[PDB]
Amino acid sequence: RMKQLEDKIEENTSKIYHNTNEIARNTKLVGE
């Protein structure tokens, strides 16, 4: 199971990575 769990953690890390970039884009677009 542990390798799969490491898989799942990495899938979450990747989703977070992309979300962080999208948030940054929104932050810039709402900024003055």
24 binds Cl ion (CB under 5 A): no
16 binds Cl ion (CB under 5 A): no
Give the amino acid at 14: S
Provide the 10 A C-beta neighbour count for residue 8: 9
Least gap, CB of 15 to its own copies (angstroms): 5
* Long-range Cβ pairs for the range 1-8 (8 Å, 24+): none
What backbone torsions phi and psi does residue 26 show, to the nearest 5 degrees? -60, -40
> Interface with Cl ion by CB under 5 A: which residues?
9, 12, 23, 26
> Interface with its own copies by CB under 8 A: which residues?
1-2, 5-6, 8-9, 12-13, 15-16, 19-20, 22-23, 25-27, 29-30
